[PDB]
Design a protein around this ligand. Sequence first.
Ligand SMILES: *[C@@H]1O[C@H](CO)[C@@H](O)[C@H](O)[C@H]1NC(C)=O
Ligand SMILES: *[C@@H]1O[C@H](CO)[C@@H](O)[C@H](O)[C@H]1NC(C)=O
Ligand SMILES: *[C@@H]1O[C@H](CO)[C@@H](O)[C@H](O)[C@H]1NC(C)=O
Ligand SMILES: *[C@@H]1O[C@H](CO)[C@@H](O)[C@H](O)[C@H]1NC(C)=O
Ligand SMILES: *[C@@H]1O[C@H](CO)[C@@H](O)[C@H](O)[C@H]1NC(C)=O
Ligand SMILES: *[C@@H]1O[C@H](CO)[C@@H](O)[C@H](O)[C@H]1NC(C)=O
Ligand SMILES: [Ca+2]
Ligand SMILES: [Ca+2]
Ligand SMILES: [Ca+2]
Ligand SMILES: [Ca+2]
Lengths: 515, 484
Amino acid sequence: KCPAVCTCTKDNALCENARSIPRTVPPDVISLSFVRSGFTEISEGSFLFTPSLQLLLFTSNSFDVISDDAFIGLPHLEYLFIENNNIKSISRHTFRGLKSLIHLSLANNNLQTLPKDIFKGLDSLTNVDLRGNSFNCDCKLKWLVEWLGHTNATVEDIYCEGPPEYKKRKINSLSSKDFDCIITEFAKSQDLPYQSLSIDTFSYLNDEYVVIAQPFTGKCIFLEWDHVEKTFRNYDNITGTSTVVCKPIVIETQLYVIVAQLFGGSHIYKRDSFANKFIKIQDIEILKIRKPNDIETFKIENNWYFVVADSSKAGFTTIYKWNGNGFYSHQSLHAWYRDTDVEYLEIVRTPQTLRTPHLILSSSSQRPVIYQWNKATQLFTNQTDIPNMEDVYAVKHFSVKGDVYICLTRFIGDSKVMKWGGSSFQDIQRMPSRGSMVFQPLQINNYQYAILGSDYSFTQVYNWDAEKAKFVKFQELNVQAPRSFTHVSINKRNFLFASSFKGNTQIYKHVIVDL
Amino acid sequence: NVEEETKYIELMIVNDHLMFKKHRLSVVHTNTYAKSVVNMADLIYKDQLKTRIVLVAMETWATDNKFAISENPLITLREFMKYRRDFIKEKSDAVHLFSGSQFESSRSGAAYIGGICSLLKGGGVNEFGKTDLMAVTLAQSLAHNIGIISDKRKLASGECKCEDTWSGCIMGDTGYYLPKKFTQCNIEEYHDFLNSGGGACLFNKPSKLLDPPECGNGFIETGEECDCGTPAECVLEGAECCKKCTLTQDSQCSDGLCCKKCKFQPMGTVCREAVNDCDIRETCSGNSSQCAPNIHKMDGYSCDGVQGICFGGRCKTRDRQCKYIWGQKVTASDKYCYEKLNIEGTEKGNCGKDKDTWIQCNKRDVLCGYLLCTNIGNIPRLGELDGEITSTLVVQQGRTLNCSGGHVKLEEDVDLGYVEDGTPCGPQMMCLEHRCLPVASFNFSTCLSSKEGTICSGNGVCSNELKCVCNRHWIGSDCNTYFP
Ligand SMILES: *[C@@H]1O[C@H](CO)[C@@H](O)[C@H](O)[C@H]1NC(C)=O
Ligand SMILES: *[C@@H]1O[C@H](CO)[C@@H](O)[C@H](O)[C@H]1NC(C)=O
Ligand SMILES: *[C@@H]1O[C@H](CO)[C@@H](O)[C@H](O)[C@H]1NC(C)=O
Ligand SMILES: *[C@@H]1O[C@H](CO)[C@@H](O)[C@H](O)[C@H]1NC(C)=O
Ligand SMILES: *[C@@H]1O[C@H](CO)[C@@H](O)[C@H](O)[C@H]1NC(C)=O
Ligand SMILES: *[C@@H]1O[C@H](CO)[C@@H](O)[C@H](O)[C@H]1NC(C)=O
Ligand SMILES: [Ca+2]
Ligand SMILES: [Ca+2]
Ligand SMILES: [Ca+2]
Ligand SMILES: [Ca+2]
């Protein structure tokens, strides 16, 4: 009562060069083995009518696929060894239906992949052997990493054979780092009917509000999250002529907004307590501040300051200290220069360990210059220029771990990222771009992006690579004339605003994908 | 109409050594860069002032810096005009300097106001900058040379407005957002400058560019017998005449004031009338398609009767000086006011200052002293008021006249409120350094004369280029021959 292809003793069966699986075994057969059989594939739902099996092994065979539920009908199956074969892929529910399985070995058959949670359903498992296979390590072997540390069953060590970047590395020794298995995408949730220039946000009573500077019609737009079936809605306007920058400041639960124009442009507002109407407080002199370009807000040592980038040679860059009632002139910088941008950044200047506030302002034809804060005189004293780059329009800053880097913008040429050393800035990455009016890094949930706009071609968005220590090309955005990019964080919802000078401005939604 | 004619500025640019070194110490780079600056400034002037700027000559100093450059743009302007007057012999309507050094001043450049078509005042000085930036600087310097002013009573009060709120105008202070358009008041100030007989030499249309020829640009170069503003705008004038920048046999004139339906003008037909008593009206030669180069009366000719004497086609009197300094509503005071003020030697009337002392004015130099005007406003139309205003009331036989004056500052040594040089104090008299002097002390000349004691034989008018414009019934260089 034993097939002629197989050599069979009373309780054991050894089959070689079998074309198809015989489904009829002697009742007292316990163990079964297949060696170099001519099987194309395992039979779908095979090994029924033979429940007496306890041990089953396959060696030196050739399999393209092992179908799901291939081992159903084996309630007494305990040991299973499929090794020393050549297999490409198996299906996940293959081992499903075997709760009596204890020992399993897929070793040395040169497997490059395994489907997520292949081992579910085997709760009696004790020993598993996967050694001797070429392991290409990606998100599949990430779930595998999840399973190795969580299973009480013992598993001998296995090693990554791919990618060549990760060679001869223990799969047991891997963490969540260097696995960006999550995909991030930016898709436009909303398009706004108006062309924009600058955007900034502020938080009041758990409500987040966003300010937009519309230059031509002169509208300083204040919008809010409607929270009722609406993504964004404009709730208030401030009307001025040739508005450039609308920067809000909140000091001690009080809302103040600075608007800048080129004629009678210096203005400081404060919101009315009742009806949320904005009321103008101060008018800074027209004669001293002419043709403003950029405005940055910064607070230093329990004191709020305020800086305006004067784009005119006649006017000077000015910092304003704030007493109880309003802003008044504190210091002036860079006389008889055309200042394109100003930036505030706190860096660690050696040998000193704490951070020191610093200012970086860029001119038209001039190299950017840096000012070091001096506490004793309440001034910025040490003034140095960063060498070997010209025609820098804007400089932005970001910090990764304990290092602080800067992104320097160039309209035509190499906009480049630099590392802050102990004394000066060090070259990190050179990135060519055309028509770039902005190079803005953004930090969103431990993800450092860097957006480089273009008034001519696509806006190039870059992502941070942790172990490559530089940015990498990430995505391409279609915005007419980008000028500023702003990160907006709602309750568990993340958005980005993209300015458009010659076209309608865009609102993108940040989405996170789990694969 | 003098406004409707599209004028042409013959510009010569001189690049110093610092500018040459910022341009890779290379001749081609400096040349192309300056050409581009002139290109942008000309793109501005073309739409605004109906005036083209053509660059016909350029010289760059790669050997050494010729003179002593200064951080003050005014000193650099003076010294540069000294270099032009003593060295530069090339013919041009204006000569500007492109300097690589930085000026420590509120201004990006300096140029003499209304100095166009002068040898001494015909220049300008601009500092280094980006392309569009130095295009603006050259635009406002040439605006100074062409008679445009930035400040005025109308602009200070608000009547003259720049209506670009996102960028200033050219005469205003320049920021990173650069101006593209003038105010209408600047336009009308230019038009008033031209209606006064100023800027005569700007009607010469350049036929030789120093760059390779191009068809369809509006200028006739070598290899082409005719040119149009553009193939699209040709249709207005010269579309019957010129195709592919070549004329058909029936036509020799593409376009111009003297060309009508592809025919020249009859000789002696008037293209442009005289704009004042200093200008001479020009007639079509019947040879060229453009009207004859602008020509005005020679210096020393009487204008506005005996009240003024012609300089550069422009009439200089004390009434026009009052109206120019303090606005159109101002009128010159009666002679009693000067005649009385000079004797006292007070602060209100005076003839000059040596060292914190007033000179007792002579009785002949009375009208060369402090300039006085009846109805005076609080602010000067140009420059800024040094000190405070002056008001002396004078009574004669019960008549009361508030004679008023002021000291107006442009340059440290240039002070308005003083009688301008060349202004007549008396018949056959003129004011120089606040003193009445005869005309024979000015070394005057007068075109070849055929008859005795008569300018151009008395049958014609002398020109600024020292050539006789005979009247009717007279021909020749001296106007001697008679032709009825
Ligand atoms: C064994 O499994 C338990 C949960 O059943 C877990 O708490 C423990 O960490 C595991 N031990 C090892 C060594 O994996
Ligand atoms: C606010 O500005 C928008 C355009 O930005 C305009 O359509 C709307 O009417 C304005 N609302 C008010 C109340 O002025
Ligand atoms: C700051 O350093 C710069 C050059 O690096 C120098 O010009 C300046 O004098 C320094 N300031 C002080 C206060 O020493
Ligand atoms: C015009 O041509 C005639 C000869 O036909 C000549 O005598 C005269 O001098 C020319 N005039 C000018 C201004 O070229
Ligand atoms: C005298 O001068 C004042 C200004 O100083 C002016 O307002 C007034 O009209 C003048 N008086 C006469 C009679 O011109
Ligand atoms: C001009 O006058 C000066 C003296 O003022 C005299 O030396 C010179 O010879 C004169 N020039 C001519 C051309 O007459
Ligand atoms: Ca900034
Ligand atoms: Ca000319
Ligand atoms: Ca041509
Ligand atoms: Ca004339």
